[PDB]
Amino acid sequence: PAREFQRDLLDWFARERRDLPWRKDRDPYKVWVSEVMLQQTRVETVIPYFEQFIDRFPTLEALADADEDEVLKAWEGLGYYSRVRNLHAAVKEVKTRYGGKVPDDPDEFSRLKGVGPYTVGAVLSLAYGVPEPAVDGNVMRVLSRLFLVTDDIAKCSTRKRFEQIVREIMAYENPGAFNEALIELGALVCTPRRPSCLLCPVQAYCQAFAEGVAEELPVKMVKQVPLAVAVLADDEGRVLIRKRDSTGLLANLWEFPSCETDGADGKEKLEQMVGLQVELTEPIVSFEHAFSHLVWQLTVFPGRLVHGGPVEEPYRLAPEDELKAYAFPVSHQRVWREYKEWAS
DNA sequence: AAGACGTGGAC
DNA sequence: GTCCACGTCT
Ligand code: SF4
Ligand code: NA
C-alpha cells in the first residue's frame, strides 16, 4: 500500500516540517555535521552547537584544516567526543582523496570513519537523492509500530530487517523527502511515550494502532568508579592539567590530574602519581558524574605545586585565564567550578 | 554480539 | 531513580 502511504506521509511532512537550522539547505557538509551531532543527542541541545560549529567551520575544508584541539573545544559539552574526532578525520580524507566533495556512492562514503548505515542513508538521500534507507531510533520506532515488529530493537539484525522494509516502501521518486518525513514523524507524532495516533497521517496503515498496542512498542531490554582529582596551583596561580590518551574514555580532552582509587583509601595514590613535587590538603568536595556505562564518584583535592623540573609527558602548565581555551569534560568543568567557589 | 562511548532534560 | 538515545566502532 506504499504509494498511498507515501503521499499521505509526504503531505503531512510538507505541512508540519520544522524549520531547523540544518534544514536551510541540503549542503552535504551541513547535513553530515548535523547528523553526527544528532547521534544520541536531543535536537534542542544540538541547535546552538551546530550554529557555533558552522560559524567556526563554514565549509568542509575549513573543518579539515583546523587543529584538533580547536575542533574538540567546539564540541565541548556535547558528549561522545569521538564522534568529532572521526568527523574531523573523515573530512580530512574527503578533502585529500575526494577533492573536497562528499562522495555520493554509498560504499565509498561508508568507508569514512564515524559513518555507518544510518549516516550513509541520511546524508546521501538528503544531499544527493540516493535511495538508501536512513533508519535511526525514530524510524525503528515508527516501523515497529506500523508493521507490528516485536523483535528486540537492540539485536544487531533487527535494524537490517527495518532497512529491508524501507527499501520496499520508499518513495524512489523522492528518497530524501521520504526519509526525512519518516524521521520527523517519529520526532513529532509517533513518539516514545503517548504517541498521537489520533492525529497521525499514516494511522490507517498502522497495525499497532489497530491492535491497540502502539504504546508497547518497540520492545527493547552500570559500574561505580571512585576518582581522585588534583587541582594543583603555582604561587603564580598557574594550574597543572594534562591531555588524556588518544584512546578510551574522554579521548584527547584535557583534565585536572586524576586517578582511580578503588574506594576511599587515601590521597596517596594521587600524590604518588609523580613523573613534580606536591603536598595535598584535605578534600573540599565530592560529587558524582554519570556516563552511559559508568559513574565517576569524584573527590577533589586542592594542593600546592612546586617546580623541580620541566613539565612534559601529556602534562601542561596552564595559567588560569587560559583554562577556558582548553576542552574539558563536564565532570572536570565542575571540578574547576567547585574549586573556584571554595577559593572564596 | 553486545559493550564502550557523554550529556542533559522530560517524566 | 528511567528513557531518550541504533549510532558506530569494536
Ligand atoms: S498510528 Fe500511532 S502508532 Fe501507528 S504510526 Fe501513527 S503514531 Fe505511530
Ligand atoms: Na564507516
CSV table of C-alpha atoms (C1' of nucleotides) and ligand atoms in Angstrom, one decimal:
chain,number,residue,atom,x,y,z
A,1,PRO,CA,0.0,0.0,0.0
A,2,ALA,CA,3.2,2.0,-0.3
A,3,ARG,CA,2.1,4.5,-2.9
A,4,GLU,CA,-0.8,5.8,-0.8
A,5,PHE,CA,1.4,5.7,2.3
A,6,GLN,CA,4.0,7.9,0.6
A,7,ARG,CA,1.6,10.6,-0.4
A,8,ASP,CA,-0.1,10.9,3.0
A,9,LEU,CA,3.3,10.9,4.7
A,10,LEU,CA,4.7,13.4,2.4
A,11,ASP,CA,1.7,15.7,2.6
A,12,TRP,CA,1.8,15.7,6.4
A,13,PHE,CA,5.5,16.4,6.1
A,14,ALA,CA,5.1,19.4,3.9
A,15,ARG,CA,2.8,21.0,6.4
A,16,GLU,CA,4.5,20.1,9.7
A,17,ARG,CA,8.2,20.1,8.9
A,18,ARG,CA,10.2,22.1,11.5
A,19,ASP,CA,12.5,24.8,10.1
A,20,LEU,CA,15.6,23.5,11.8
A,21,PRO,CA,18.9,25.2,11.0
A,22,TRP,CA,20.4,22.3,9.1
A,23,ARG,CA,17.3,22.2,7.0
A,24,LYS,CA,18.1,25.6,5.4
A,25,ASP,CA,19.8,23.9,2.5
A,26,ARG,CA,20.9,20.4,1.5
A,27,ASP,CA,24.7,21.0,1.6
A,28,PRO,CA,26.2,17.6,2.2
A,29,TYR,CA,28.7,19.1,4.6
A,30,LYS,CA,26.0,20.8,6.7
A,31,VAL,CA,23.8,17.7,6.6
A,32,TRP,CA,26.7,15.4,7.6
A,33,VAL,CA,27.7,17.7,10.6
A,34,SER,CA,24.1,17.8,11.8
A,35,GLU,CA,23.6,14.1,11.6
A,36,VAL,CA,26.8,13.4,13.5
A,37,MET,CA,25.7,15.9,16.2
A,38,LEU,CA,22.2,14.4,16.5
A,39,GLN,CA,23.5,10.9,17.3
A,40,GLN,CA,22.2,10.2,20.9
A,41,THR,CA,21.7,13.9,21.4
A,42,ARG,CA,18.4,15.9,21.5
A,43,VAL,CA,17.6,18.5,18.8
A,44,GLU,CA,17.3,21.4,21.3
A,45,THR,CA,20.7,20.6,22.7
A,46,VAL,CA,22.3,20.4,19.2
A,47,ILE,CA,20.9,23.7,17.8
A,48,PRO,CA,23.4,26.1,19.5
A,49,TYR,CA,26.4,23.7,18.9
A,50,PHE,CA,25.5,23.4,15.2
A,51,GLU,CA,25.3,27.2,14.9
A,52,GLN,CA,28.6,27.8,16.6
A,53,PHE,CA,30.3,24.9,14.8
A,54,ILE,CA,29.2,26.1,11.3
A,55,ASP,CA,30.2,29.6,12.3
A,56,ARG,CA,33.7,28.4,13.2
A,57,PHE,CA,33.9,25.9,10.3
A,58,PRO,CA,31.7,27.0,7.5
A,59,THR,CA,33.0,24.6,4.9
A,60,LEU,CA,34.2,21.0,4.9
A,61,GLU,CA,37.7,22.4,4.0
A,62,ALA,CA,37.6,24.8,6.9
A,63,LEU,CA,36.9,21.9,9.3
A,64,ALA,CA,39.6,19.8,7.7
A,65,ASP,CA,42.3,22.5,8.2
A,66,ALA,CA,41.6,23.3,11.8
A,67,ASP,CA,43.7,21.9,14.7
A,68,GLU,CA,42.1,19.0,16.5
A,69,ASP,CA,42.1,21.0,19.8
A,70,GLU,CA,40.0,23.7,18.1
A,71,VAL,CA,37.6,21.0,17.0
A,72,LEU,CA,37.2,19.4,20.4
A,73,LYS,CA,36.7,22.8,22.0
A,74,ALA,CA,33.8,23.4,19.6
A,75,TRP,CA,32.3,20.1,20.7
A,76,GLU,CA,33.0,20.7,24.4
A,77,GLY,CA,30.0,19.6,26.4
A,78,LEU,CA,28.2,17.7,23.6
A,79,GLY,CA,29.2,14.2,24.8
A,80,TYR,CA,30.6,11.2,22.8
A,81,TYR,CA,33.6,13.1,21.7
A,82,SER,CA,35.0,10.5,19.3
A,83,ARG,CA,32.1,11.4,17.0
A,84,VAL,CA,34.0,14.6,16.3
A,85,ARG,CA,37.4,13.0,16.1
A,86,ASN,CA,36.0,10.7,13.4
A,87,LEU,CA,34.2,13.5,11.6
A,88,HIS,CA,37.4,15.5,11.7
A,89,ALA,CA,39.3,12.5,10.3
A,90,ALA,CA,36.7,11.7,7.6
A,91,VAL,CA,36.6,15.3,6.5
A,92,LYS,CA,40.4,15.4,6.1
A,93,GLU,CA,40.1,12.4,3.9
A,94,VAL,CA,37.3,13.9,1.8
A,95,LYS,CA,39.5,16.9,1.2
A,96,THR,CA,42.6,14.9,0.3
A,97,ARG,CA,41.0,11.9,-1.5
A,98,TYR,CA,37.7,13.2,-3.0
A,99,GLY,CA,38.8,16.7,-3.8
A,100,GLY,CA,36.6,18.2,-1.0
A,101,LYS,CA,33.4,16.6,-2.4
A,102,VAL,CA,31.4,14.3,-0.1
A,103,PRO,CA,31.2,11.1,-2.1
A,104,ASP,CA,27.8,10.1,-3.4
A,105,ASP,CA,28.4,6.4,-3.6
A,106,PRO,CA,27.1,4.6,-0.5
A,107,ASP,CA,30.1,2.2,-0.4
A,108,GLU,CA,32.8,4.8,-0.7
A,109,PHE,CA,31.1,7.1,1.9
A,110,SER,CA,30.5,4.3,4.4
A,111,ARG,CA,34.3,3.7,4.5
A,112,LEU,CA,34.8,7.0,6.2
A,113,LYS,CA,35.2,7.0,10.0
A,114,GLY,CA,32.1,7.6,12.1
A,115,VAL,CA,29.9,7.0,9.0
A,116,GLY,CA,27.6,4.0,9.4
A,117,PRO,CA,24.4,2.7,7.8
A,118,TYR,CA,22.3,5.5,9.3
A,119,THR,CA,24.6,8.4,8.3
A,120,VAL,CA,25.1,6.9,4.8
A,121,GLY,CA,21.4,6.9,4.3
A,122,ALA,CA,20.7,10.2,6.0
A,123,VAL,CA,23.4,12.2,4.2
A,124,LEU,CA,23.3,10.7,0.7
A,125,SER,CA,19.5,10.8,0.4
A,126,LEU,CA,19.1,14.4,1.6
A,127,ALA,CA,22.1,15.9,-0.2
A,128,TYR,CA,22.0,13.8,-3.4
A,129,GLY,CA,18.8,11.9,-3.6
A,130,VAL,CA,20.4,8.4,-3.3
A,131,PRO,CA,17.6,5.9,-2.5
A,132,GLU,CA,19.3,4.4,0.7
A,133,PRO,CA,17.4,3.7,4.0
A,134,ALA,CA,18.1,6.0,6.9
A,135,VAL,CA,16.9,4.0,9.8
A,136,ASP,CA,17.6,5.6,13.2
A,137,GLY,CA,15.8,5.1,16.5
A,138,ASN,CA,12.9,7.2,15.4
A,139,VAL,CA,12.4,5.2,12.2
A,140,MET,CA,12.9,1.9,14.1
A,141,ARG,CA,10.0,3.0,16.4
A,142,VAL,CA,7.7,4.0,13.6
A,143,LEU,CA,8.3,0.9,11.6
A,144,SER,CA,7.9,-1.3,14.6
A,145,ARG,CA,4.5,0.1,15.3
A,146,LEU,CA,3.5,0.4,11.6
A,147,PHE,CA,4.3,-3.3,11.0
A,148,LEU,CA,3.9,-4.6,14.5
A,149,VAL,CA,7.6,-5.8,14.7
A,150,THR,CA,8.3,-7.2,18.1
A,151,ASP,CA,12.0,-8.0,17.5
A,152,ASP,CA,14.2,-6.7,20.3
A,153,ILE,CA,15.3,-3.5,18.8
A,154,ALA,CA,18.8,-3.8,20.3
A,155,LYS,CA,19.6,-7.0,18.4
A,156,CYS,CA,22.1,-6.3,15.6
A,157,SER,CA,20.0,-7.9,12.9
A,158,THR,CA,16.8,-6.0,13.9
A,159,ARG,CA,18.0,-2.9,12.1
A,160,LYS,CA,18.7,-4.9,9.0
A,161,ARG,CA,15.0,-6.1,9.0
A,162,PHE,CA,13.9,-2.4,9.2
A,163,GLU,CA,16.3,-1.4,6.4
A,164,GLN,CA,14.8,-4.1,4.1
A,165,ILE,CA,11.3,-2.7,4.9
A,166,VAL,CA,12.4,0.8,3.9
A,167,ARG,CA,13.8,-0.4,0.6
A,168,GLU,CA,10.3,-1.7,-0.4
A,169,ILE,CA,8.1,1.1,0.8
A,170,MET,CA,10.2,4.2,0.0
A,171,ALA,CA,9.3,6.9,-2.5
A,172,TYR,CA,12.0,6.2,-5.0
A,173,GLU,CA,10.9,9.5,-6.6
A,174,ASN,CA,11.9,11.5,-3.6
A,175,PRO,CA,14.0,9.4,-1.1
A,176,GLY,CA,15.4,12.3,0.9
A,177,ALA,CA,11.9,13.8,1.5
A,178,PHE,CA,10.6,10.3,2.3
A,179,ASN,CA,13.4,9.5,4.7
A,180,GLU,CA,13.2,12.9,6.4
A,181,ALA,CA,9.5,12.5,6.7
A,182,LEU,CA,9.7,9.2,8.4
A,183,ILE,CA,12.2,10.6,10.9
A,184,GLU,CA,10.1,13.7,11.5
A,185,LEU,CA,7.0,11.5,12.1
A,186,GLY,CA,8.9,9.7,14.9
A,187,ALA,CA,10.0,13.0,16.4
A,188,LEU,CA,6.7,14.9,16.3
A,189,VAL,CA,3.8,12.4,16.2
A,190,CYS,CA,4.9,8.8,16.7
A,191,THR,CA,6.9,9.4,19.9
A,192,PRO,CA,8.4,7.2,22.6
A,193,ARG,CA,5.5,7.9,25.0
A,194,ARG,CA,1.9,8.8,24.4
A,195,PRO,CA,2.0,8.8,20.6
A,196,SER,CA,-0.5,11.0,18.9
A,197,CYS,CA,-2.1,8.2,16.8
A,198,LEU,CA,-5.3,10.2,16.6
A,199,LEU,CA,-3.5,13.0,14.7
A,200,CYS,CA,-1.2,10.7,12.7
A,201,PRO,CA,-1.4,10.9,8.9
A,202,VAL,CA,-0.5,7.2,8.3
A,203,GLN,CA,-2.8,5.9,11.1
A,204,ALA,CA,-4.9,4.0,8.5
A,205,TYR,CA,-1.8,1.9,7.6
A,206,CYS,CA,-0.8,1.1,11.2
A,207,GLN,CA,-1.1,-2.3,12.7
A,208,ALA,CA,0.0,-1.4,16.2
A,209,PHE,CA,-2.9,1.2,16.5
A,210,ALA,CA,-5.4,-1.3,15.0
A,211,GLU,CA,-4.2,-3.9,17.6
A,212,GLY,CA,-4.2,-1.3,20.4
A,213,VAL,CA,-0.5,-1.6,21.3
A,214,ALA,CA,1.3,1.5,19.8
A,215,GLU,CA,2.4,2.3,23.4
A,216,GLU,CA,4.1,-1.1,24.0
A,217,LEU,CA,6.4,-0.8,21.0
A,218,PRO,CA,9.2,-1.0,20.4
A,219,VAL,CA,10.5,-3.8,22.5
A,220,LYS,CA,13.9,-3.4,24.0
A,221,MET,CA,15.8,-4.7,27.0
A,222,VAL,CA,26.5,0.4,35.2
A,223,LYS,CA,29.7,0.3,37.3
A,224,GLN,CA,30.7,2.8,40.0
A,225,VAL,CA,34.2,4.2,39.8
A,226,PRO,CA,35.8,6.3,42.6
A,227,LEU,CA,38.0,9.1,41.2
A,228,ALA,CA,40.5,11.4,43.0
A,229,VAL,CA,41.2,14.6,41.2
A,230,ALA,CA,44.1,17.0,42.0
A,231,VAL,CA,43.9,20.8,41.5
A,232,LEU,CA,47.5,21.9,41.9
A,233,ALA,CA,48.4,25.6,41.5
A,234,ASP,CA,51.5,27.8,41.4
A,235,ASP,CA,52.4,30.7,43.6
A,236,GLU,CA,51.7,32.4,40.2
A,237,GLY,CA,48.4,30.7,40.1
A,238,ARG,CA,49.1,28.6,37.0
A,239,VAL,CA,47.5,25.2,37.2
A,240,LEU,CA,48.6,21.8,36.2
A,241,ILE,CA,46.5,20.0,33.6
A,242,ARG,CA,47.1,17.1,31.2
A,243,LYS,CA,45.7,15.8,27.9
A,244,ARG,CA,44.1,12.4,28.2
A,245,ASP,CA,45.1,9.4,26.0
A,246,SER,CA,44.1,9.4,22.3
A,247,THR,CA,42.1,6.2,23.2
A,248,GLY,CA,39.4,5.1,25.6
A,249,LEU,CA,37.3,7.3,27.9
A,250,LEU,CA,37.2,11.0,27.0
A,251,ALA,CA,39.9,10.6,24.4
A,252,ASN,CA,42.1,13.7,23.9
A,253,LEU,CA,40.3,16.0,26.2
A,254,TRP,CA,42.1,17.9,28.9
A,255,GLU,CA,41.6,17.2,32.6
A,256,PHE,CA,43.0,18.0,36.1
A,257,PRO,CA,45.3,15.1,37.0
A,258,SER,CA,43.4,12.2,38.5
A,259,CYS,CA,43.4,8.5,39.1
A,260,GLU,CA,41.0,5.7,40.0
A,261,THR,CA,41.3,4.9,43.7
A,262,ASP,CA,39.0,1.9,44.3
A,263,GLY,CA,37.0,3.0,47.4
A,264,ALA,CA,38.2,5.7,49.8
A,265,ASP,CA,41.7,4.5,50.7
A,266,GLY,CA,43.6,7.8,50.5
A,267,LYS,CA,45.0,10.8,48.8
A,268,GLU,CA,48.3,9.0,48.3
A,269,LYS,CA,47.5,7.3,45.0
A,270,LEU,CA,47.2,10.9,43.9
A,271,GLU,CA,50.4,12.2,45.4
A,272,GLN,CA,52.3,9.1,44.3
A,273,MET,CA,51.4,9.7,40.6
A,274,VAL,CA,54.8,11.5,40.0
A,275,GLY,CA,56.6,11.5,36.6
A,276,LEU,CA,56.8,17.0,40.3
A,277,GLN,CA,56.7,18.0,44.0
A,278,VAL,CA,53.3,18.1,45.6
A,279,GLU,CA,51.6,18.0,49.0
A,280,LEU,CA,47.8,17.8,49.1
A,281,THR,CA,45.4,19.4,51.6
A,282,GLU,CA,42.1,17.9,52.8
A,283,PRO,CA,39.5,17.3,50.0
A,284,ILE,CA,37.0,20.1,49.6
A,285,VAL,CA,34.1,18.4,47.8
A,286,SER,CA,32.7,15.1,46.4
A,287,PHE,CA,30.1,14.8,43.7
A,288,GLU,CA,29.4,12.1,41.1
A,289,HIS,CA,29.4,12.2,37.3
A,290,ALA,CA,27.3,9.8,35.1
A,291,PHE,CA,28.4,8.3,31.8
A,292,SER,CA,26.3,5.8,29.7
A,293,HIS,CA,28.3,2.8,31.0
A,294,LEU,CA,29.9,4.0,34.3
A,295,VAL,CA,29.6,6.6,37.1
A,296,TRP,CA,32.6,8.5,38.4
A,297,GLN,CA,32.5,9.4,42.1
A,298,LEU,CA,34.9,12.3,42.2
A,299,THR,CA,36.7,13.7,45.2
A,300,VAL,CA,38.8,16.9,44.5
A,301,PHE,CA,42.0,17.7,46.5
A,302,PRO,CA,43.4,21.2,46.3
A,303,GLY,CA,47.2,21.4,46.6
A,304,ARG,CA,50.3,23.5,46.1
A,305,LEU,CA,52.7,22.8,43.2
A,306,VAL,CA,56.5,23.4,43.3
A,307,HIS,CA,58.8,23.2,40.3
A,308,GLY,CA,61.6,20.7,40.2
A,309,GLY,CA,62.0,20.0,36.5
A,310,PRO,CA,60.3,20.6,33.1
A,311,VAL,CA,56.6,19.9,32.6
A,312,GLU,CA,56.2,17.3,29.9
A,313,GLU,CA,54.5,13.9,29.3
A,314,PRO,CA,51.0,14.9,28.4
A,315,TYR,CA,51.1,17.5,31.3
A,316,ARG,CA,50.9,21.2,30.7
A,317,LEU,CA,51.3,24.2,33.0
A,318,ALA,CA,48.2,26.4,32.4
A,319,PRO,CA,47.8,30.0,33.6
A,320,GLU,CA,44.2,30.4,35.0
A,321,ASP,CA,42.9,32.8,32.4
A,322,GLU,CA,43.8,30.2,29.8
A,323,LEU,CA,41.8,27.2,31.2
A,324,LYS,CA,38.9,28.5,29.2
A,325,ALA,CA,40.8,27.8,26.0
A,326,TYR,CA,41.1,24.0,26.5
A,327,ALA,CA,38.3,21.4,26.2
A,328,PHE,CA,37.4,19.7,29.5
A,329,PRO,CA,34.7,17.1,30.0
A,330,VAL,CA,31.8,18.4,32.1
A,331,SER,CA,33.0,16.5,35.2
A,332,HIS,CA,36.2,18.5,35.2
A,333,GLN,CA,34.5,21.8,34.5
A,334,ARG,CA,32.6,21.1,37.7
A,335,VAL,CA,35.9,20.3,39.4
A,336,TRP,CA,37.2,23.7,38.5
A,337,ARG,CA,33.9,25.5,39.4
A,338,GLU,CA,33.7,23.9,42.9
A,339,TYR,CA,37.4,24.7,43.5
A,340,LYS,CA,37.0,28.3,42.4
A,341,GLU,CA,33.9,29.0,44.6
A,342,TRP,CA,35.7,27.2,47.5
A,343,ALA,CA,38.6,29.7,47.0
A,344,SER,CA,36.1,32.4,48.1
B,1,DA,C1',27.0,-9.9,19.9
B,2,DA,C1',27.0,-6.7,22.8
B,3,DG,C1',29.8,-3.3,25.3
B,4,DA,C1',32.4,1.3,25.1
B,5,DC,C1',31.4,5.8,24.5
B,6,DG,C1',28.8,11.9,27.3
B,7,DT,C1',25.3,14.7,28.5
B,8,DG,C1',21.0,16.9,29.7
B,9,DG,C1',16.3,17.3,30.2
B,10,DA,C1',11.0,15.2,30.5
B,11,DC,C1',8.9,12.4,33.4
C,1,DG,C1',15.6,6.8,40.1
C,2,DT,C1',14.3,5.8,33.8
C,3,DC,C1',14.3,6.7,29.0
C,4,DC,C1',15.7,9.4,25.1
C,5,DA,C1',19.3,7.7,22.6
C,6,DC,C1',20.7,2.0,16.8
C,7,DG,C1',24.8,5.4,16.1
C,8,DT,C1',29.2,3.5,15.2
C,9,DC,C1',33.3,1.0,16.2
C,10,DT,C1',34.8,-2.8,18.1
D,1,SF4,S1,-0.6,5.5,14.1
D,1,SF4,FE1,0.0,5.9,16.1
D,1,SF4,S2,1.5,4.3,16.2
D,1,SF4,FE2,1.0,4.0,14.1
D,1,SF4,S3,2.5,5.3,13.2
D,1,SF4,FE3,0.9,6.9,13.5
D,1,SF4,S4,1.5,7.4,15.5
D,1,SF4,FE4,2.9,5.6,15.3
D,2,NA,NA,32.4,3.8,8.3
